[PDB]
Amino acid sequence: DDIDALIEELQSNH
Amino acid sequence: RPVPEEYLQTDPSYGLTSDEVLKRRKKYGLNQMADEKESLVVKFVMFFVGPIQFVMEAAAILAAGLSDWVDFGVICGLLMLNAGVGFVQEFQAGSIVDELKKTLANTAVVIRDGQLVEIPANEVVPGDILQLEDGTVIPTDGRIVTEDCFLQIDQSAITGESLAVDKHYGDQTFSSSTVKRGEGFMVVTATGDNTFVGRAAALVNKAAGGQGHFTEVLNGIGIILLVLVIATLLLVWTACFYRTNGIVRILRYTLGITIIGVPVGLPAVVTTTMAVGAAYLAKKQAIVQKLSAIESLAGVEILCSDKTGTLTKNKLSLHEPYTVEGVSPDDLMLTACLAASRKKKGLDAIDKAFLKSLKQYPKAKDALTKYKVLEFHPFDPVSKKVTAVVESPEGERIVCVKGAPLFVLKTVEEDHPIPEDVHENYENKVAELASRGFRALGVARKRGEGHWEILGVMPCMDPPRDDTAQTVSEARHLGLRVKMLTGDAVGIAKETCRQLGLGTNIYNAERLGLGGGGDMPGSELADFVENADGFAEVFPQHKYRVVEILQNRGYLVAMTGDGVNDAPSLKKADTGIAVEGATDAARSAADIVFLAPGLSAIIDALKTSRQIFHRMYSYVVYRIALSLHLEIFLGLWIAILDNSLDIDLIVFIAIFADVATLAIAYDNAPYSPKPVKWNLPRLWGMSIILGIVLAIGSWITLTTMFLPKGGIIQNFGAMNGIMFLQISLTENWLIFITRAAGPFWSSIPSWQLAGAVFAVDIIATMFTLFGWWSENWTDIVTVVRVWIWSIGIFCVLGGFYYEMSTSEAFDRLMNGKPMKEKKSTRSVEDFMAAMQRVSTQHEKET
DSSP: OOHHHHHHHHTOOO | OOOOHHHHOOOTTTOBOHHHHHHHHHHTOOSOOOOOOOHHHHHHHHHHSSHHHHHHHHHHHHHHHTTOHHHHHHHHHHHHHHHHHHHHHHHHHHHHHHHHTOOOOOOEEEEETTEEEEEOGGGOOSSOEEEEOTTOBOOSEEEEOOOSSOEEEOTTTTSSOOOOEEEOTTOEEOTTOBEEEOOEEEEEEEOSSSSHHHHHHHHHHHTTSOOSHHHHHHHHHHHHHHHHHHHHHHHHHHHHHHTTOOHHHHHHHHHHHHHHHSOTTHHHHHHHHHHHHHHHHHHTTEEESSTHHHHHHHTOOEEEEEIIIIIBOSSOEEOOOOBOTTOOHHHHHHHHHHTSOSSSTTOOHHHHHHHHHGGGOHHHHHHHTTOEEEEEEEEETTTTEEEEEEEOTTSOEEEEEEEOHHHHHHHHHHHSOOOHHHHHHHHHHHHHHHHHTOEEEEEEEEETTSOEEEEEEEEEEOOBOTTSHHHHHHHHHTTOEEEEEOSSOHHHHHHHHHHHTSOSOOOBHHHHSSSSOOSSOHHHHHHHHHHOSEEBSOOHHHHHHHHHHHHHTTOOEEEEEOSGGGHHHHHHSTTOEEOTTOOHHHHHHOSEEEOSOSHHHHHHHHHHHHHHHHHHHHHHHHHHHHHHHHHHHHHHHHHHTSOOOOHHHHHHHHHHHHHHHHHHTTSOOOOOSSOOOOOHHHHHHHHHHHHHHHHHHHHHHHHHHHSTTOTTOSSOOOHHHHHHHHHHHHHHTHHHHHTSSSSTTTSOOOHHHHHHHHHHHHHHHHHHHHTTTSSSOOOHHHHHHHHHHHHHHHHHHHHHHHHHHSOHHHHHHHHOOOSOOOOOTTHHHHHHHHHHHHHHHHHHHO
16 A cells, blocks of 8 residues: 555655 | 558567568668768859859850950959859758758667667667667657657757657657656658658758749849849940940950849858758758748748647646535545546546646655555446545545536435535536546545545646747747637637637637538628638638638748647648657658747747748848849949959959858848738838949949049049948948848847958958959058948838838838728727627537
């Protein structure tokens, strides 16, 4: 799962 | 030819095998641009090829045989000038394309027989898998095949600016680009002379000879110039027949006239300008299939752009959510995300949008990890709701439901009667989002055995791209009107128009007509499709109709296309645009293939194309005006006074005129706002007026110098020297005039062009001072006075050019067409009112 990692990879544009 | 898809279907974990790598090396080749070294040969190639070149070298041989060293020197100087200007032009083009093809990153990482290995980028071959890490540089054209985390690349980063874009499964990654973030695997499609960058370089190299519509217009310009040259030759020969003169004198005069009357540099210079412009467009993520497109994009008047790819990010995002009183947006977002599958598999675009927008709600991000999901019912099409029973950190079971607004409202109502005010407000808001095109997701939660509580709605839609409203306003500043074509309903697209500020005046493509039906009159339908701000529910058949009717009005149309079904319209479009991700059929049927998604890239390439066109047009007008000025002045001189400039001075004038070519490619390019359409009648009127003004100034100098006491001569000087200086000054300063988009003082010329022109003027001043190839020395005082008079002529040229180029009256006079139609000042308002009425009715059709 690892939701938070998926969250950041989905918003990887900073 | 594009590689077959079979080569691209390789296993990302095992990769290709070494023997097949070798066989494809035999088939396709290395990632290496071809290098050629023929610097010595091309210099004499310019000497030989070209009919004017053979006839003029034959004339040189004849003059050498007749022991007339003078005309032999004239022809040798002209030939050396032509060879030099051609060689420097081709050298500039070669340097530009080598900068375009510069690839020094190499360092390819691939996997052979399942084993990762690092090889130089040359060894790669199309149909191969390459590993992409953070910070890596793309060696060859390819496509991203694997998706674990979305990738960000700098494909737009060829100039200093980066403008990174995102790439996912299916996106087409591009050579000479740097990876800014992300990782994955990439299947390479082309490796050399087949990638669009290499294809553009090869197109420039092939077009160094010259082919296209601009070649035809160059042929027309050259034919007319030869016509004027024959005219002034007839004038001088008639006037020198009336006065019985030696045939040597007449031939010297005709040589002097033909040195400058025909510009032998126009074809090569315009062709090189197109080549360098195609290179610059390739720098701007826009490869023209033909060089003519560079002009075709320059004069485009209407831009019909697809909504899904250009004016929107194409990503289903999240918008500001409506919430019920007493429920915070953070709690609502946490509830919505908790109703989503923890497993990555199964999440649709709505869920991805929710967990993407989770950034704005840190409380939800911190709280989601504290809930343990007990059970999960995924999206059921019948109930249209996803359910998730989770365990709170306090031990409370929480039921999370997200789905259709009406269905969620009924589900909450099925357990407890919602107050009528909340229900009415919620329904009104749902209808309001429906009118704005947001797809709405209702969210509800259940705490243990307590009642259902609904928290709000989720507006989701593809937003305008970040640089779109700015881009739309800038395009409006560029004199071209943007019409959006979308497959969605009129109501959905009206909100998109409002977001872009286009003007929210759209129509259903089918109902308005465009399909052989509809009771709207043909003229009224044409006016509607001309003045509309967009078209909703568009279809591939309607796009062709829109292009056809728009072109029937004389409007240059630029149509963007993605699918294969758009191929005919792109062919019918005056400049078919293939946006990023377009099918290979659409790219083949397009005129200019784009690389960076978004209307900003299209408008930037349009600005670059306008710059290229204005550079070429400025050079053409400047050189034709120089030819006209010298033709008129010298023809009148030998017709009336039986004299002309020294022939070597004429050669030096021609050399100075062609020297500004060596710097015209290096200057800062100002682009005209309004479209540029190769207005040949206007161009010829402009050139004739400028040449007449220069001839008038030169004749004023002649008339002044004829009087005793000097006239313009202060103590002493030379007739030929002073006239040569004045002609050089008033001629080579015209490039400062034509290069400007408007008045000559609006745009400051670059250091290269100004330096070249000033060096030419300094050399001419030294020629006049020291009397080289002239009768007598000319002192500094009359030289600076000639400089001042040439500055005055430069200023009057500025006035004439500003008042004639920017005046539509002169354009009407030259073209000969009347003052358009001058539609009644009140019927235009009634027509706009009818536009609005039909747009409202098309919205109300639903």
